[PDB]
A paper describes a structure:
Programmed death-ligand 1 (PD-L1) is a key immune regulatory protein that interacts with programmed cell death protein 1 (PD-1), leading to T-cell suppression. PD-L1 is a 290 residue, type one transmembrane protein, which contains two extracellular domains: an IgV-like domain (PD-L1 D1) that binds to PD-1 and a membrane proximal IgC-like domain (PD-L1 D2). VHHs are single variable domain fragments of heavy chain–only antibodies derived from camelids. We have solved the crystal structures of two representative VHH/PD-L1 complexes, revealing distinct VHH binding modes to overlapping sites.
The crystal structure of [name] bound to PD-L1 D1D2 was determined to 2.2 Å and revealed one complex molecule in the asymmetric unit. For [name], residues 1 to 119 were well defined and could be modeled into the electron density maps calculated. For PD-L1, residues 18 to 235 were modeled, except residues 215 to 217, which lie within a flexible surface loop of D2. PISA analysis of the crystal structure of the complex revealed that the PD-L1 D1⋅[name] interface contains a combined buried surface area of 1178 Å2, with 600 Å2 from PD-L1 and 578 Å2 from [name]. Residues within the CDR regions contribute 95% of the total buried VHH surface area, with CDR 3 showing a 32% reduction in solvent accessibility. The interaction between [name] and PD-L1 D1D2 includes four hydrogen bonds, R35 within CDR 1 to A51, S50 within CDR 2 to H69, S53 within CDR 2 to Q66, and H100 in CDR 3 to E58. Another key interaction involves F104 in CDR 3, which sits in an induced hydrophobic pocket on PD-L1 D1, with I54, S117, and A121 forming the top of the pocket and M115, Y123, and Y56 forming the bottom. This region has previously been identified as one of three druggable hot spots on the surface of PD-L1 D1 that would be favorable in accommodating an aromatic ring.
Numbering used by the authors:
A (entry chain V): 1 to 118
B (entry chain A): 18 to 215, 218 to 235
The structure:
């Protein structure tokens, strides 16, 4: 079993920037794939960014060139660098992890609110 | 729940065949290829690691190199079918497919490998042209162990000497040899039957003319 604790959310104005952090404690691994999802209010949860064990990345079209997902395996930390924030970036951001070590399972954070003022 | 289905959890596969083993997962509309993750493992070996619509070959165990493929056309119809070419006894074991697509589940599949003595090499040597004594030899490889029954053309049982060794050409496979020493004439027929212990494969041996190119 694994815990994900997201942090860094808050109030930023459009064109601004911030780093989200997710601290992963428990049965983690550099072989686990990790992700950032977000849910705008009464919209559907969407995939933002994805990082494989091999450090290979996918980004949803609306954040390509603005957001960067990276991992620090030593510190069990996942990062999202968000540049050139837009009001539609406003959402709860959730950290996500696909565990394989004990069993095959995915884990969710509780999320961190990002608010982009115009 | 998002649940991975397996239409069968047990495959009996013939040595040297190709097998396709299936994991079924729900797919409603066009699939987010990006979101989809498929792993296939046998025990501690990684076979297929499909992430961000591509395979990571760098992580695949060497014993599955060039012989394992995920059928990507099937992925659209909710099908994670693993095909393995040229199946050997080392491919026997428990397979796990693991899928993440709006949730995450795995299923176990047992593969058994059947290795019959269906291929028989034969050799007929004259021992002494005078007595007309010949040495008939059949050999085949398979698993498990086999006895060899020698029969005359009238299907009477004759006594041969069998030798069982571990195959050198492969692994876990037995190499079985039986020779019959008998006084016989040109065009007489003998049969050797490989009968696995714990199916019956028969070869026909026809006595040829005495060779005229022979030393004293
Ligand atoms: Mg989905």
């Amino acid at each position: 079993e694994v815990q994900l604790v997201e942090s860094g959310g808050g109030l930023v104005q459009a064109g601004g920037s911030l780093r989200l952090s997710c601290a992963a404690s428990g049965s983690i691994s550099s072989r686990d794939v990790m992700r950032w999802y977000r849910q705008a209010p009464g919209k559907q949860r969407e995939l933002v960014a994805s990082i494989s064990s091999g450090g290979g990345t996918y980004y949803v079209d609306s954040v390509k060139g603005r957001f960067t997902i990276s991992r620090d395996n030593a510190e069990n930390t996942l990062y999202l660098q968000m540049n050139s924030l837009k009001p539609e970036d406003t959402a709860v951001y959730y950290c996500w992890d696909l565990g394989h070590r004990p069993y095959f399972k995915d884990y969710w954070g509780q999320g961190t609110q990002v608010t982009v003022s115009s | 729940m998002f649940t991975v289905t397996v239409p069968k959890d047990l495959y009996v596969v013939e040595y040297g065949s190709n097998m396709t083993i299936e994991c079924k997962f729900p797919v409603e509309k066009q699939l987010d290829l990006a979101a989809l993750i498929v792993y296939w493992e046998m025990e501690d070996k990684n076979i297929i690691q499909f992430v961000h619509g591509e395979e990571d070959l760098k992580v695949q165990h060497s014993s599955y190199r060039q012989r394992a493929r995920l059928l990507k056309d099937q992925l659209s119809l909710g099908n994670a079918a693993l095909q393995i070419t040229d199946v050997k006894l080392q491919d026997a074991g428990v397979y796990r497919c693991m899928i993440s697509y709006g949730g995450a589940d795995y299923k176990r599949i047992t593969v058994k490998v059947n290795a019959p003595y269906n291929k028989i090499n034969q050799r007929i040597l004259v021992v002494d042209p005078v007595t007309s004594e010949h040495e008939l030899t059949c050999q085949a490889e398979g698993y498990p162990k086999a006895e060899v029954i020698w029969t005359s053309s009238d299907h009477q049982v004759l006594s041969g000497k069998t030798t069982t060794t571990n195959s050198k050409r492969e692994e876990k496979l037995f190499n079985v040899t039986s020779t019959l020493r008998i006084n016989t004439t040109t065009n007489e027929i003998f049969y050797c039957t490989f009968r696995r212990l714990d199916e019956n494969h028969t070869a026909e041996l026809v006595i040829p003319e005495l060779p005229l190119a022979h030393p004293p």
